[PDB]
Symmetry: D3
Subunit: 202 residues, 6 copies
Amino acid sequence: HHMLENKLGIINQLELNRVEERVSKENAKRLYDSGDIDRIEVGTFKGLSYIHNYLFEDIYEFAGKVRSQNISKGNFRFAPVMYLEIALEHIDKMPQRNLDEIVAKYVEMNIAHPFREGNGRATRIWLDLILKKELKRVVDWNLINKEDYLSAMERSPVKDLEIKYLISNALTDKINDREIFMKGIDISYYYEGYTEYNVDEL
Amino acid sequence: HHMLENKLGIINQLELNRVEERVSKENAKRLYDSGDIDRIEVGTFKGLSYIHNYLFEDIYEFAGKVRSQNISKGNFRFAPVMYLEIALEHIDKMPQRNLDEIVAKYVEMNIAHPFREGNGRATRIWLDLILKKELKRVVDWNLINKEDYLSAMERSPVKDLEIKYLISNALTDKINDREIFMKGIDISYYYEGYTEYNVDEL
Amino acid sequence: ENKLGIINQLELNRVEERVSKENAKRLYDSGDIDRIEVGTFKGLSYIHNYLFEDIYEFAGKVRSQNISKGNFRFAPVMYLEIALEHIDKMPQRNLDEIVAKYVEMNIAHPFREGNGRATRIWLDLILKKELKRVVDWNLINKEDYLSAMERSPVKDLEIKYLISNALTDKINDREIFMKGIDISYYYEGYTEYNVDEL
Amino acid sequence: HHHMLENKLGIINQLELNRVEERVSKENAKRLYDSGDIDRIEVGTFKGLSYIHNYLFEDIYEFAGKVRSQNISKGNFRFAPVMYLEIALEHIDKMPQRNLDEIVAKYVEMNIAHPFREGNGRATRIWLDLILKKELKRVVDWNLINKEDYLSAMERSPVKDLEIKYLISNALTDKINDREIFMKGIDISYYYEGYTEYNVDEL
Amino acid sequence: INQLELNRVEERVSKENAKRLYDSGDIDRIEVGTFKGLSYIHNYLFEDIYEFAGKVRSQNISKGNFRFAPVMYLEIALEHIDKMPQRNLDEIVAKYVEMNIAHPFREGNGRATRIWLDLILKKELKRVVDWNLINKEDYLSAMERSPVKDLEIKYLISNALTDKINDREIFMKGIDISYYYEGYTEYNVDEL
Amino acid sequence: HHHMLENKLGIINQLELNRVEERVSKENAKRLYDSGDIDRIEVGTFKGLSYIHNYLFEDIYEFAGKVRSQNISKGNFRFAPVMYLEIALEHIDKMPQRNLDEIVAKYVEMNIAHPFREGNGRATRIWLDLILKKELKRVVDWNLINKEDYLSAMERSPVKDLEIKYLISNALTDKINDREIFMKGIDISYYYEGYTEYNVDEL
Ligand SMILES: Nc1ncnc2c1ncn2[C@@H]1O[C@H](COP(=O)(O)OP(=O)(O)O)[C@@H](O)[C@H]1O
Ligand SMILES: Nc1ncnc2c1ncn2[C@@H]1O[C@H](COP(=O)(O)OP(=O)(O)O)[C@@H](O)[C@H]1O
Ligand SMILES: Nc1ncnc2c1ncn2[C@@H]1O[C@H](COP(=O)(O)OP(=O)(O)O)[C@@H](O)[C@H]1O
Ligand SMILES: Nc1ncnc2c1ncn2[C@@H]1O[C@H](COP(=O)(O)OP(=O)(O)O)[C@@H](O)[C@H]1O
Ligand SMILES: Nc1ncnc2c1ncn2[C@@H]1O[C@H](COP(=O)(O)OP(=O)(O)O)[C@@H](O)[C@H]1O
Ligand SMILES: Nc1ncnc2c1ncn2[C@@H]1O[C@H](COP(=O)(O)OP(=O)(O)O)[C@@H](O)[C@H]1O
């Protein structure tokens, strides 16, 4: 699964964590600066798969591809592989006209959790693209506290009020401001326990 | 709670996470290199409080003192504040003769969760000292996968088999090896989302 | 979110009660209630639309969003259709099977709202056809009922006991029906009107 | 015996009992405010909460104003055990209430304590408003908090109080002596609990 | 050593103790509805088998997803239970449900506390439980549910109550069914 | 209907029914091994598992070897919905089984599927052992897995299978054609499920 392990000779979890952060943040920076981010299908699993492969190819085996194993976090079982493809088609047809509908679509894509790893970071980029297109807003992720965010996502399959509230109060109209995107990548990786680098210095 | 946030006027989450890592890891290196770690009471809340205050004095308000608020993680509500002092009295009297008793005592101290923050890093140092005294072993924490460790702790209030096997298989006889300690500190902080520095380079 | 354009929650509660109870009275007194298919989603959909089409755009139609209550996630939309086909084929010969079928219909929770009130009407029509009984709903305490439904996806013992001990043979008694409407609405927090007096 | 109006004239079913309990205690809530009695209650203590509960439910609930002697639950949640209830209320009495974070934590602990057999919801929200009024010069406009949002947030709150804090924070108003805020808040608060027949204004 | 063999020995030895408890008349002489009475029952059944039989555990225990009363409150919880009323079925079942949450022994709480429950019902309602009339999986599910709502277990108990409160065969067959609930099926207690 | 012997023989006592169902199905398990029939079963497929289930239970359970038609639960866990059993079982048939990680994940999914009304635990463990024998040249020495450890690990396994994987891994033996391991394993397996009356050897 961790393609860099055998290639760089890493036998330490923290060292592997840092290298995967560096390489994927390099790809994340290029995604934005190349303008490739603007030519991705918005709000579909085809767009999400592209983001995920863009971030993690040469890092995760099968980056951009659905997982073949069932996974969980805390006590929550994500969508079973057996109807994973069915779930993703449903999400593709969900509406995205207002914040209520966009947050619900994001919550369902987190529940699907289609990749083995990288779901959190890749789906937040995907979410920002839906908000930018439909609401002319993106998230200022530093205004969402890490533990508040993770608690809200844990709560969200049952009730999405917490994550909707957090997102709503962090929306900004500066949808073409490069620094907001870049600051948000560092915060987004921080949520997942990657704190070594700043995307802008790579 | 976060003293550096209010003192230095930090307003970026990631910056606060990094400086809180730097200063507490600087203290962690001193704790070991000064020999102060070898003079602590072993297996008591007094000894755990000393460790917690050593790491987090001037970082967390009331470091080394029991919290006055109720806290939770995921879906789990930790020991009520009303009953914390008597819960710690019970843990002090728990036996620690073998791996079973030691792990059960560790699991109860995690359930007590006596500090507002920092329970994970502080209690793992405390655990290593119990294992050292009673079994002449310490944990090689890099041998315990981060996600395996965190899921095992979430499980442990119901059944501690998972954490016990993870600890058992990671034990090493190198109880006075500085490299094992320092690498364990870095892995331990990595479990909790701090990856910026290496402790022995501070 | 509604045809009446009401955006005050307490006002919506009261007008929904009066309007849907008005429709419920007509369902019964018109005899329309006796011409519903018994024990199928078609018939539940007919009841739900009868009650709610004045108010809610979706009346009688399967939801397209996912919903939950308490800590329970109801049947996912992606297999709502197949879930309802399965329920349509479940047996209803005795009380054990009728309660099982009711419990699965609640798990499906097919409408955006109104599932509780519409499906209890639907249940009474199954009991009436197969056991010549209906529920005397005031004999079921509100909090016992709600907690029994919360338990029922795991085990249906609680709700089965409550229904069994409240069955009555007065299956054509208009006051048993009307008071059952009022108690059923009371379960869901609507208490202003008596359907009888509308 | 808990419902002391159980056997009165015309009280023949659960709905009729619900309605008379709504009318009598809302009549009490109106007098509580319009008499000025509400302004004399000790703020932020269990002594204050029991005065409110007794004011609303005296002669409706047996033992109104008194701590329950039975354990109770709601949904999947077990409230504080009776065996240490009085000590739990003493600890709540000492909790700070200087800012919104602290006030909401104190409210959440009082709801976990759930000290009465019934009527905890409605009595404790009035109590909450008086704390907010004294300490922040704000009260909750309960009409800006949806019923199902509110109930779910309370179910969430023993684990994390973020949901209910957001709902309270966005509904705060500085109209702390506005009669309609209070009166409509009483009607909304009762509607949260399944009582909808009357407007407190009109009793 | 074989797990099954230990299980069979424990059944045989403790079921013998249950028969003596009833046949000797000792069961009629114990305090009804208190932890002291329950402790006497547990020691009587398991004296030879469990270390610290009849004594409150010193470890925290769980079953399924349920964490039983933590040891530090165990004494105060048993004290509360001792004071709980037992005048009707609602109160008895609540008292029984609280004693199961307490779970005061390391093992054998189920079998000892059901004997204890029958004695409360005998004294206060002049009824005991015909345990064969409560299906095993119905019972265990109802007990899992009981800390949240006791309606399930109350209905099962109510429909199984019999007025044959001094009938030796009701008690002995109840003992067999009670052990069956917990996975001991080898012996019939009256054939010991 | 489900318990075929209950009405045919008028067995009214739950313990007596438990013991006769143990005796009949354990007689069948003994014959499954001693006849060589076990060695012709397809390995790792629902067809093979259905063969085992019917072989043990066809005189005891109305639809032995056949998928259930109702939904079922155990503890707080709701097993795979009936509407999905077919797709679940088709997916499980395609899962790899080359190493212990993959075999355990496959066993965990077959338990979640829980395809029969009753008898899933005992039948699926025989099925598991035949996969391990084929792919790893090991079987489980079940007496080395404590009953409550096993039941707790299975309760845990839909979330994380590490607990059950450790128990299994540490109980593997290379004595894959040892009759005592198989027979004692049958007695322990039945003991896990609350059947302790007979020794399968002596039937
Ligand atoms: N208990 C939970 N239930 C549901 N979703 C969760 C839970 N905990 C975290 N999440 C969501 O899962 C995401 C993590 O997915 P993962 O594939 O691990 O991403 P990454 O590789 O980016 O860390 C989090 O960012 C959060 O959105
Ligand atoms: N759901 C859970 N239930 C119980 N314990 C947990 C859970 N999740 C994590 N833990 C334990 O709590 C620790 C974190 O406690 P915390 O006070 O946040 O420490 P730190 O400041 O070092 O991160 C983890 O290392 C783990 O041991
Ligand atoms: N936690 C729960 N789990 C499953 N079912 C529930 C739960 N709580 C309530 N129910 C059932 O759901 C019904 C409410 O559904 P809803 O669509 O809100 O109907 P209504 O609009 O009539 O109130 C209740 O009447 C009860 O039958
Ligand atoms: N599942 C739950 N867990 C914790 N608290 C809850 C839950 N559901 C509701 N609550 C809180 O409990 C209150 C109900 O208490 P109760 O004594 O019934 O008051 P009332 O008589 O006013 O209805 C609700 O207003 C809400 O604050
Ligand atoms: N998940 C659960 N939650 C609470 N109580 C339970 C649960 N499962 C079983 N019980 C109760 O616990 C009893 C088992 O207790 P235990 O100490 O193992 O007794 P025994 O040694 O007699 O088997 C059961 O008879 C039942 O009453
Ligand atoms: N809470 C649970 N969640 C998931 N699986 C469980 C749970 N409890 C037990 N199991 C699994 O289910 C099996 C029992 O299924 P069952 O069909 O009753 O088999 P049997 O008839 O052999 O007793 C157990 O052996 C265990 O593998």
